[PDB]
Paper text:
Human [name] (hBest1) is a [name]+-activated Cl− channel essential for Cl− transport in retinal pigment epithelium (RPE). Although the structure of hBest1 is still unsolved, two Best1 homolog structures, one from bacteria [name] (KpBest) and the other from chicken (cBest1), have been previously reported. Overall, the channel is a pentameric assembly with a single ion-conducting pathway, which varies in diameter along its length and is constrained at two narrow points: a “neck” contributed by three residues (I62/I66/F70 in KpBest and I76/F80/F84 in hBest1/cBest1) on a transmembrane helix, and an “aperture” formed by a single residue (I180 in KpBest1, I205 in hBest1, and V205 in cBest1) on a cytosolic helix. Here, by electrophysiological and structural analyses, we show that the neck and aperture in hBest1 are both indispensable [name]+-dependent gates, and their dysregulated opening by rationally designed or patient-derived mutations causes [name]+-independent leak and elevates [name]+-dependent channel activity.
Alanine substitution mutants for each of the 12 residues were generated in KpBest and hBest1 and subjected to crystallography and patch clamp, respectively. Moreover, the equivalent KpBest mutants (W16A, G18A, [name], L259A, P262A, G264A, and D269A) all showed an overall similar structure to that of WT KpBest. The corresponding “[name]+-binding” sites in WT KpBest are occupied by Zn2+, an essential component in the crystallization buffer. Notably, the short extracellular domains of hBest1 represent a challenge for quantitative measurement of the surface expression by labeling techniques (e.g., biotin). They can be classified into three groups by different molecular mechanisms: (1) mutations on residues involved in [name]+ binding, including W24A, G26A, S27A, L294A, P297A, F298A, G299A, and D304A, likely cause defects of [name]+-dependent activation; (2) mutations at the neck/aperture, including I205A, I205T, 3A, and 4A, increase open probability by functionally mimicking a constant open state; and (3) mutations outside of the neck/aperture, including D203A, P233A, Y236A, Y236C, W287A, and W287F, alter open probability through the neck/aperture residues.
Numbering used by the authors:
A (entry chain A): 21 to 290
B (entry chain B): 22 to 292
C (entry chain D): 21 to 289
D (entry chain E): 24 to 294
E (entry chain C): 23 to 291
């Protein structure tokens, strides 16, 4: 939302009403000096800084989580190749679950229908199993767990090597919880609330308290200052929705294609 | 808002200063802005650090709770994956894990666990659990006996027992982390004196503002007091993430989620 | 007498000295404005802010270190119960080592005498061994490990299950190193050196600069600015020795109590 | 940078010889407003430079891990299979291939020469076919370890100890990829840069009122401070970007090669 | 050094007083307000920077903490798992102690030969000295000891593994210290911040003088002290393996390490 070019423009308009209405000032007895707006301005900058910090960390964590999908699924596929080179059937099954897991997680975070993707990757019976669950993505881990478990029952994996691969499903479990946590735990609203008020009220009142000092250069300076606060406030906005579909949000489709392309590269009998 | 009170209180004090500004020279009282710029910026800097510290507590607490869901999900998965047919154990262990969550929430909210416990476990167990001064720990220990017995009975190997044992440790770390964020507050000086300071600063501020703003002073002073006081109380809220304030953690919702997860479809699983 | 008040009262005095002496300023050739004191005050506030941040983090780390003791001991005893439910002989021995470890750790950090706490807990053949070492706490860990080792040699623990319990001793190992590191490595004394000087001198010289602008108001404002600064500075100092005996420091006594009661509860004592 | 210092001096000299015309027209520039702007920018640069620094440090840590993992893997190979020098040499090849290949991948440069020197041409073709060559190298390292296991020279346990090390390299590969196909601040980084750029150009105009002829000196000093801090952030933000200092990455890949040749007695020269 | 810049600063204040007369005449005005802006900017930057420096120092301290922990726990595992193998005990301890001293040498860029000779047979010294990285070669030798115990069937794969993990931890320590030592952030950008604070401090009185007159040097020195104190403390912490006041007592830390390992293996300093 580029209300930035709206507020920038609404700012010019506030400068102009300030310039012309500057007379009726002492009649009334209303004075605005810079100094107390420097105090508030500074306080707001500090609080914006700390807040944007949190915003940024949340977005970084969203990237890291998704990064771990790629890492853990890569490594699970590696272990399967290196430990069971012969077993391409199991290879293909486990891969399709891992790929399904990624897509499913994207769908869940975007609240979209994973049915088509699941159906492209899995047999109908497995899809039914997945979609029947109140927690589909988590049920994909269970099914992948079951493949690993069969290999174990059949003696193709020992307890040790079964365990090496289980750890990978643990990591994917940490991704899934993390994303869920992030999705339902925003940076607290109070922050963005408080700050949105103060930053808007501030950019509004500002040309009024600059007009005393600047006369005609009010608009050009009040705009430059306001853009600075709003640019910085809006970087938070652009970082607060990691899973969304906006241009600034995570390109989750491409990340899913990357994951799928990677797992497919590591298979094919080679 | 206890804030709306003190915001209005700041408007009264701000009128007082508009009426007093002539009588300044009579009484002998000059008051420039610049010392209040100095003081205000210091307080802002300290409010920044304090707030950041509070948020960290919030975020750790949120995370420790996230681990409950993860760890419990992976323990159930492992039991389903390794002992697919052992539904009686599945059911027993899941109820301990669910008891674990609720018990932890009660522990931290200082409320009575009994209703939630009885809902989930047989009564002998509820008394074994309520008998301990550490009920959450006792639930963990009981959950441990379940996997221990599967091992004694040769149903788990040492390896596979260990994979599950790891998950109980993960929950032990949550229990410990949560107890540390609960019993251990951030010292009472931090809040006690910082609140004094922010308020004292806010009331005096217009006295120093008049000379410059004259009439506009009640406005531009309430705006400043909002900013400082908003920030201070939010910090105070977030410091106690298991409290029942608006910006604290939805502990009830989070246990509902955990429960719905483990018990999803009468606990039925494929293969 | 309480130091902070003394420094406040020494500041109300510094202020009067400044009101009375403002007359002589013109004469003696001393002009003092607020603006440079702003620059300095802010600078000091910034550095005070980051400094306090470090002190808090040190306090938090100590807290976490102690939290690990309770976690790792609980899970060790839990494992002992879950893996060897019959072997209460070993349970009791190991639990007493774990309880000794905490008290030993506590006393070590307080630079006090473990003898009573250890005598309350262990046999004399062991207490003297432990006190014979310049590293008692590490020695208790070595002994807890013997227990776990014996159970392994006796075939009661497999290599694997031994392994599971070994990790928990490692975790206690890290707590010991951490606490020792915090006890012996201070927040560089330079932090308290530069900041105590600077903050005191600043609060002192400040009324001399406020008087120009504030006159008889000087005391009120200057004491305020001083309380803010000194309050923040002293908070850093209290947070910095987390292992101290102040009421503002960690209640190590209560924590070791919680630990002991906890492991006893788990063994049915 | 030096271009923007010279432009700042030019803008200063303009500010001086035009101070007359403009301030008479009713267009004024005080210092207090630009002091508010500049402090806020400074605050933002501070927070920004912190995010930057920490991406730089994360890059150091990831590359640190390569050094650590690769050393410990080769150590394990020697301690567990002292006799299997052919395997030692193959595995060391892939490990060193991995480093160089990662470096090439991050710096968008050609890995071919490094691969051709280290590996058989079959392997190089396979690696070069893949859209993920670095990952492929790890996969090849994996087969080496996997074969020693299949041949019964490694047990599942000791296989596992080495498998850990490969996972560590997987974490590095991905972390680095994430640090490259960055950033996270989606080119706001150009906004703040222009904000600083503009602030520094308007600055002499806001200053000349108070400084007159001293303007260019005090304006350039301030500009230098702001522009430097901004430049530092830009450097730090982008550890793998096209203008990055390649000395340390090259030093690291050289160190690991040297260390591993040392560990497998390929150094020193025989007598 | 700090006292040099302070004296040079008292001098420059006088230059500003004596030459304030010519100010009007030469056509040079210098207000406080612009210097406040620069000043606060720089303070913010020093605040952030100093905090990065402290972070590095705390990490360095921590890494050394792990040497002690990992080494203690390795010896512990050796005693608990192989109580009879006291030859191995002694040889591995020799390597672990060699490791610490060699690490100090590496970080101080000094010769490890004396310390190595005190601890190990000459054949082993030659092997260790021949390597581009003596500390890495020491871990490999420690690794053969446990490896040989594994070959001989005296350790299982599992118990070898528990011990392997500790060597893995030492490798991590080595790496982290290597990273912190060779981690001059572009050598340019610490020299640039130094000239910055320096230049600012020398120009400050010229700007302060209009307001302060004779008081210039007092305020100007107080301010310069504050900023320089901050800046130089950062520089110390930035290089924790150096030989400055507030840099790690690495020789003391190595002594503690050696003493601990000797204590654990029944030997007497
Ligand atoms: Cl395949
Ligand atoms: Cl394949
Ligand atoms: Cl897990
Ligand atoms: Cl634990
Ligand atoms: Cl017992
Ligand atoms: Cl018992
Ligand atoms: Cl490693
Ligand atoms: Cl070789
Ligand atoms: Cl992995
Ligand atoms: Cl070799
Ligand atoms: Cl350890
Ligand atoms: Cl010994
Ligand atoms: Na261990
Ligand atoms: Zn992993
Ligand atoms: Zn295949
Ligand atoms: Zn979005
Ligand atoms: Zn986990
Ligand atoms: Zn079941
Ligand atoms: Zn008025
Ligand atoms: Zn643990
Ligand atoms: Zn017992
Ligand atoms: Zn008995
Ligand atoms: Zn005594
Ligand atoms: Zn490692
Ligand atoms: Zn070899
Ligand atoms: Zn002039
Ligand atoms: Zn070499
Ligand atoms: Zn003039
Ligand atoms: Zn360790
Ligand atoms: Zn021995």
């Amino acid at each position: 939302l580029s209300k930035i070019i709206f507020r920038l423009l609404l700012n010019v308009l506030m400068s102009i009403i300030a310039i012309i209405s500057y007379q009726w000032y002492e009649q009334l007895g209303i004075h605005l000096t810079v100094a107390p707006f420097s105090l508030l301005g500074i306080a707001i900058a500090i609080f914006l800084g700390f807040r944007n910090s949190a915003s940024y960390s949340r977005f970084v964590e969203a990237r890291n989580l998704w990064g771990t999908v790629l890492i853990a699924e890569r490594t699970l596929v590696r272990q399967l190749r290196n430990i069971l080179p012969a077993e391409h059937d199991a290879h293909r099954r486990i891969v399709s679950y891992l790929v399904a897991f990624s897509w499913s997680l994207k769908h869940q975070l975007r609240k979209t229908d994973p049915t088509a993707d699941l159906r492209r990757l899995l047999p109908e019976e497995r899809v039914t199993e997945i979609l029947a669950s109140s927690m589909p993505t988590n049920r994909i881990l269970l099914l992948a767990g079951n493949e690993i478990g069969q290999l174990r029952e059949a003696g193709k994996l020992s307890d040790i090597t079964y365990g090496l691969m289980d750890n990978k499903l643990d990591e994917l479990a940490h991704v899934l919880g993390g994303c869920e946590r992030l999705a339902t735990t925003p940076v607290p609203f109070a922050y963005t609330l408080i700050l949105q008020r103060t930053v808007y009220l501030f950019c509004t009142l500002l040309p009024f308290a600059l007009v005393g000092d600047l006369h005609y250069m009010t608009p050009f300076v009040s705009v430059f200052i306001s853009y600075t606060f709003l640019s910085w406030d809006s970087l938070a906005e652009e970082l607060e929705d990691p899973f969304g579909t906006a241009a600034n949000d995570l390109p989750l489709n491409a990340m899913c294609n990357t994951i799928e392309r990677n797992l497919l590269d590591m298979t094919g009998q080679h």
